[PDB]
Amino acid sequence: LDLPLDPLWEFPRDRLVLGKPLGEGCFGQVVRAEAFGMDPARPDQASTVAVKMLKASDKDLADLVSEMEVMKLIGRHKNIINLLGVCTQEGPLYVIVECAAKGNLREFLRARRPPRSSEGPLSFPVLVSCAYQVARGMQYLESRKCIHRDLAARNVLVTEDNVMKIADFGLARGVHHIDYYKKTSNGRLPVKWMAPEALFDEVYTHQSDVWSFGILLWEIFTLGGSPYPGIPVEELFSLLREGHRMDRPPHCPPELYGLMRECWHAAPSQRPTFKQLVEALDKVLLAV
Ligand SMILES: C=CC(=O)Nc1ccc(-n2nc3c(=O)[nH]nc(N)c3c2-c2oc3ccc(C)cc3c2C)cc1
């Protein structure tokens, strides 16, 4: 408490009904919720939102406050998870964002793996659209000087209308104390998304995010596959020092594997920019 009141963002906590937790092992810090009157022109209208709360140290408060203020600054875009409001007065700190109903893109793809017996849910144009939308979101974040630093399919959320929304672009990443052997409770090894300059030299640019986007492209066109399959972290270190790159996935046209390999060029200036990736993927989508 004793946080400043920002009337542009403050939302009455009694207009929230907190619901079931999100994430896997977060001690009830992020929950689904219903909000009433998030649109002040429809004060009684319900909507589904997501709420993040503390618990907590003085540092924990400052981290969330900083994460909140980052979202305030970055502004709104169709392909990111947008801040909707905050509860800072007369109670616990809440940060309210959009709820993307279908969950993260990795789980979305894996659950959709294949008269229409030969037709799985996911067609090539819709896979390209997913990649294009993420590229557009990332191009927006870069224009606002935001480096994501862990861009991955697990950090892209999918709305009821299959819109991609980049999540956690404003989360603290503790880049100076990453356990490179860390395996998440879902079995993910996040070191597998890190650009070499980040992993080896602790340098991040927008071009490091471009590297991770290449890994994300590979996840899309393997319908949520795990990158560097079967390669433990110790071997990944030596393979990246030798310049190893992932193989072309099955059922993946050369245009897309081409984009992947460009995103993994050693020199960051020889990777495409997000603006170039948007245009390249746009051409593929228009090719139908
Ligand atoms: C300990 C690890 C952990 O916490 N892991 C986790 C992973 C995903 C989600 N998650 N999942 C969805 C989803 O499926 N649809 N829509 C969402 N907004 C979703 C969110 C979500 O909610 C938020 C509310 C406020 C802020 C500031 C950020 C978020 C995020 C990212 C929550 C927790």
UniProtKB/Swiss-Prot annotation:
User: What's this protein's function?
Assistant: Tyrosine-protein kinase that acts as a cell-surface receptor for fibroblast growth factors and plays a role in the regulation of cell proliferation, differentiation and migration, and in regulation of lipid metabolism, bile acid biosynthesis, glucose uptake, vitamin D metabolism and phosphate homeostasis. Required for normal down-regulation of the expression of CYP7A1, the rate-limiting enzyme in bile acid synthesis, in response to FGF19. Phosphorylates PLCG1 and FRS2. Ligand binding leads to the activation of several signaling cascades.
Name-wise, this protein is Fibroblast growth factor receptor 4
Identify the residue ranges that face the Cytoplasmic compartment according to the record.
1-288
Q: Name one GO molecular function term.
A: ATP binding
* Residue numbers of the full-length protein present here: 452 to 750 of 802
GO biological process entries? cell migration; cholesterol homeostasis; fibroblast growth factor receptor signaling pathway; glucose homeostasis; peptidyl-tyrosine phosphorylation; phosphate ion homeostasis; positive regulation of catalytic activity; positive regulation of cell population proliferation
Instruction: Name all Protein kinase domain ranges.
Output: 16-288
Q: How is it modified after translation?
A: N-glycosylated. Full maturation of the glycan chains in the Golgi is essential for high affinity interaction with FGF19.
| Subunit description | Monomer. Homodimer after ligand binding. Interacts with FGF1, FGF2, FGF4, FGF6, FGF8, FGF9, FGF16, FGF17, FGF18, FGF19, FGF21 and FGF23 (in vitro). Binding affinity for FGF family members is enhanced by interactions between FGFs and heparan sulfate proteoglycans. Interacts with KLB; this strongly increases the affinity for FGF19 and FGF23. Affinity for FGF19 is strongly increased by KLB and sulfated glycosaminoglycans.
Q: What is the scientific name of the source organism? A: Homo sapiens
> What GO cellular-component annotations does this UniProt entry give?
endoplasmic reticulum; endosome; extracellular region; Golgi apparatus; plasma membrane; receptor complex; transport vesicle
Q: Where does this protein hold ATP?
A: 22-30, 52
Pathology noted in the record is: FGFR4 variants may be involved in the pathogenesis of various cancers. It has been found in prostate cancer as well as cancers of the breast, colon, head and neck, larynx, lung, skin.
Q: Which domain of life is it from?
A: Eukaryota
| UniProt keyword Lipid biosynthesis present | no
**Consequence of mutating residue 250 to T?**
In a lung adenocarcinoma sample; somatic mutation
Q: Which family does it belong to?
A: Belongs to the protein kinase superfamily. Tyr protein kinase family. Fibroblast growth factor receptor subfamily.
**Which tissues is this protein detected in according to the database?**
Expressed in gastrointestinal epithelial cells, pancreas, and gastric and pancreatic cancer cell lines.
Q: Please give the chief subcellular localization of this protein.
A: membrane
